[PDB]
Each structure stands twice: as structure tokens, then as C-alpha cells.
């Protein structure tokens, strides 16, 4: 995912307003289910959110998870929420990217019941 991020105050969560892969504006009215490359399974994808501040070239990367079963997972309308390990580092209105790494499972729960690779998200 690519875009700019807005901090949800009081939490370590951020809302990303999606851009296109080339950083162009994303258009929810195209005849597609969701931005191209959007995850197509329900689960918890862990990765890294990286950001560069354009004025000074400063950079930052933070652990981040996207739950594609969340009501705040709405990539078709350009909105995706990430859970991160920070409540302060990310600037607004700066290019931000999510690089996926793998998947996680709530470990107090029955093993291997998520992700569910054949359950589409509600885009």
C-alpha cells in the first residue's frame, strides 16, 4: 500500500489515504474491486510502514499490521488502517509505503484458523 497517513490520536493506529502505485490520486469509481494488488484474503498481514520527509530526506520505518477483515479495511474507497508500534513518528502529508512480510495468528487461539485464504475481504 502507498499513500499518506493520519494518526488516530490516543492509539498506535494510522489511517492511510491510498494513492496509486505511481503516487497518483486513486479513483474509487474505476471498474475494479479495489486497487490493483490489494490483498485478496482475510487475515492479519504484518510488514513495515516506511516514510521519507521530503524537505530533509529523513526516514523512518515501523512495524505495522493490517487486518483485512477489519471494518476499517476499505481499500476500494481508498482507506486502510494500520496498527503500528508508534504513536508519534509518522508525519502527515508525506509519502508512506507498506511493505508486506508475512502473516500472524492470535496465538491464544486454535492454531492455523487464520489467515483464511479463500475468504475475500469486503473491499
Amino acid at each position: 500500500f502507498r499513500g499518506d497517513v493520519t494518526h488516530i490520536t490516543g492509539s498506535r493506529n494510522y489511517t492511510m489515504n491510498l494513492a496509486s502505485q505511481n503516487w497518483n490520486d486513486y479513483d474509487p469509481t474505476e471498474e475494479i474491486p479495489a486497487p490493483l494488488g490489494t490483498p485478496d484474503f482475510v487475515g492479519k498481514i504484518q510488514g513495515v510502514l516506511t516514510q521519507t520527509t521530503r524537505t530533509d530526506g529523513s526516514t523512518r520505518g515501523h512495524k505495522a499490521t493490517v487486518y483485512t477483515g477489519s471494518a476499517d479495511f476499505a481499500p476500494k474507497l481508498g482507506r486502510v488502517q494500520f496498527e503500528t508500534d508508534t504513536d508519534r513518528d509518522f508525519e502527515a502529508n508525506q509519502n508512506t509505503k507498506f511493505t508486506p512480510v508475512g502473516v500472524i495468528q492470535d496465538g491464544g487461539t486454535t492454531h492455523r484458523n487464520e489467515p483464511q485464504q479463500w475468504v475475500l475481504p469486503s473491499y
Partner: nanobody
Amino acid sequence: QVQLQESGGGLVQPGSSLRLSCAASGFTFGGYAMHWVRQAPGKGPEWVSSINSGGDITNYATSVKGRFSISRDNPSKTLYLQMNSLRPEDSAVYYCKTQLANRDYRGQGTQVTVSS
């Protein structure tokens, strides 16, 4: 058949506010994302705003963020666009559109001119 009919356009002064409506019929309306798009003279159509079924997800084009507000009433199958702090460059025909299965549908539109 699916039907969408916009209303509420007119000629208004820069800085004023205006509310557009779109009456829908022929489908559940609830359950489907709805969108506002606009077409200025001499240009192609561009996305303005989007809203999901319950209204808990909305989004806006960068050029109208902070000034426009999309909302919906599913029992009456009506979509709304509240426009504030209108600018000359907001002048356009405004359309409501949706997507059902693998087909798109759009209303005939309502004209909005922002000018002194």
C-alpha cells in the same frame, strides 16, 4: 430498472454552501458503495466523493477535502453531498454513480455554477 436522479444544482456565489441530492431506486441501495463525480466544462469526469453502505467509510478528492461532506439515508435511498466554501473551479455537472456486480450506473446529473 436501476434509477438515479440528482437534484439541487444552481447558480451560486463563491464562498456559499449548497446541498445536492440523489434519489435512487431499483436496487437495495443499502449494501452498495455510492459516489459523487463531476464534469467541468471542457474536461472529463472526475471523482468527488465516496461512501460505503453504513456511512462509516467516506473519502474525498484532495481538492474538496475539508469543504464537502457526503452522507446517505438508506431507508429513503437518498445520497447527499453538502458543499461549503464553494470556489469557481467547483463549477461542473455533478453526478451520482454506483457499481452493482460488474456494471456501473450513473444519473443524468445536476449543474452547479459558482460565479459572481
